[PDB]
Amino acid sequence: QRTVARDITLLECVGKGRYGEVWRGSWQGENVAVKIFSSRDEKSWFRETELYNTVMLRHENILGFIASDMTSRHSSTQLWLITHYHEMGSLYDYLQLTTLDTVSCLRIVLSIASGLAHLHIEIFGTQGKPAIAHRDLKSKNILVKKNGQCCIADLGLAVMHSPRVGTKRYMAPEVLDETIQVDCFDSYKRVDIWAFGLVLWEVARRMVSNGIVEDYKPPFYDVVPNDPSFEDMRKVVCVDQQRPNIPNRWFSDPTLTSLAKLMKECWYQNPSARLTALRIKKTLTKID
Template identity: 40%
Template sequence: MALRRNVTTVIGIAIAVVSVLAVARGVSVKLADGPTTTKCYFYNSGSDCEVNKSCKNQTEECGNAQSNEMTACFAVWKNTSDNGFVMQNQGCWDNGNDCLDRTQCISDNTVTDNTFFCCCIGDLCNGEVSFHPAVTDSPQSTKGSGSNPTPVLTGDPLICTIIYSLVPISIFTIVTIVIYWMCRRYHYTSLVSIQTSEPSPLTTPLTPTATDFQPLQLIEVKARGRFGAVWKAQMNSRYVAVKVFPLQDRQSWISEQEIYSLPNMQHENILQFLGTEKRGEGLDTAFWLITEYHQRGSLYDYLKANLVSWNNLCHIAESMARGLAFLHEPCGAKPPIAHRDFKSKNVLLMSNTTACIADFGLAVKFDPGKKLCENHGQVVGTRRYMAPEVLEGAIQFNQDAFMRLDMYACGLVIWELVSRCSAQDGPVDEYMLPFEEEVGQAPSLEEMIEAVVSHRKRPAFRDTWMKHSGLASLCETIEECWDHEAEARLTAGCVEARLSQLLRTSNQVITTTDLNHTNSSTTPLITDLSNGSTVKESSL
């Protein structure tokens, strides 16, 4: 592997050298055959001589005439409605390679404000200037100034030499890179499929007292994401999840490990972290992050295949909000943490459908008295879950602003839950991602900006949801989570409290319904949140 890397490096250096030599050869030939420039007309509209009217027809000597550096003359003029063409500057132009094969000072186009620029090779060639638009055949001669366009050379032997030299070299470079990438992917697949090298010990103990290495056997890939693949693995008699990071994503592995290893990070609604390992050597190195395994998988996978009852919806959403509230709030030595990639794929479900939050590769912690790294201000996360202030690049660089981003995404995830709830008054739609109806399954950043920022769109609420009092109440909470104004969004603690109240009310109504089956006395009516109907409250 090291040999392949060295060979690739040598090939790259050789290609660079050949390219430079080809260009240098073409330039040197052109310098030898073409005219030279020793002096040019000089004019500066801002100089003192302009005040004294003594600038006209001044010349200056060009210093690079005898060197290998090409020197040219230049002129800058402006076209005004009042005075016509007005000269701004004239003089020597050191970067004469831009002006090869131009013996007359002719501008091809304008850049801004009717300003023109031209350069040429030859003594005093900038005395007469002209504008020759690329779309017309007749130039306009004038005494004016111009913009600073990039000269366009057509039919130049130098350009042909460069093209003929670089095209095959570029093709060879691309083929080499593709072959290298394919070899690297092959070795990486072999690494995670059949482990042949001895692993290094776990950097974090699996239990408070057990520090000895425990063997792991990868079984099957459960998911693939931005930073690698997640495997179901067996460690002794238990199943665990192993997130495998390739070598180039080592920093993501370190970042996620640092978040999991924070003090007081253990919580029922945070994925349990077990340890890390380093596997392989050199370019074959892979980094493993080992966590608890949950058979039900992610909330995204669960909702695609299952409907949820009203009680189950409340339980999942409430436990999810509880985990998010734990992240956002300090807890002893644990600082506040913003997830920054909150979505249904990063919420796992335990066997009893309790939610736990996973994937902290993009998470950021807020240590007291410390400023955030500038890298944390970059746009990260999943496009369809990005808040409007992220999409339009107007996020505030502080703790509260980062927490509000998570809450916007939380509202979208709760919407996903509601969309698959069987308590709604009508047929349940097939699972759809947030904004899938509005922008499709693979929206571009521009499409998300247009939908979320320009038109302020949000995933739609169905009429059948509003006929269920509990779902209608939950939709209000969703709207307050994804409010366009970040400061108006609910906190995770507030969402948790609302969902807890909905869950308690639902359970109380169910208990009341059971009592009514054994009590036939006339009682007041209350709303049953579990199915949207009305039931009698028993008199005790």
């Protein structure tokens, strides 16, 4: 009746970490990305698979799902997530070596805000969706597309509303001080907004103005170690209430001046004071 071609040719490893590995693969002559999960991160495969079995997200700024595969082996279970492949790699990678102009900076950050608002919004009726919070938004979990927009990846920690925790460097104050209202879905949206503000800062540093640009640095590079502890982060973000520095040179440029204001409104200590993703989008469409 029909042949179901399932062979994927794994061609090059494009990432390896505690999560497992990501490979560029080929299916029917077309590139796919294959994430092969480590045993330690099996629950991320289950959560993302459960989410996609509940709602088939389809959005230009969300990494495109293709398949979830579980294969029995002699003494283990092999778990793969298969998605669209973005050859330019992650935003984190891209910002190391690339500087941006005003148009490309805004296009990047608006595309991220668009994907995030799509996650956050509940849509009713047929072809709707539950509201979703990401819970691990960061520049390594955003991919750059050839058209200059980005897409958000890795829903392994995501939560829906109708051992894995987030990356500590990007954790909001209410996570670090354990005051987050865990029974309120809006709390998780507000944690994502904090992280979005950090990503906005990382990108804006790389936008040139008046011949000046900052080197790529991760948030809080000047105040915590590599692989900062939970306590290291809590002291900076909660006790001392530090925030990423805004360089003077941004205040000569109208775009970076507006982006600095936007960042600040993602970083309020009080989570309910932070802007929503929808409001961020509107503000970004009015810049330039």
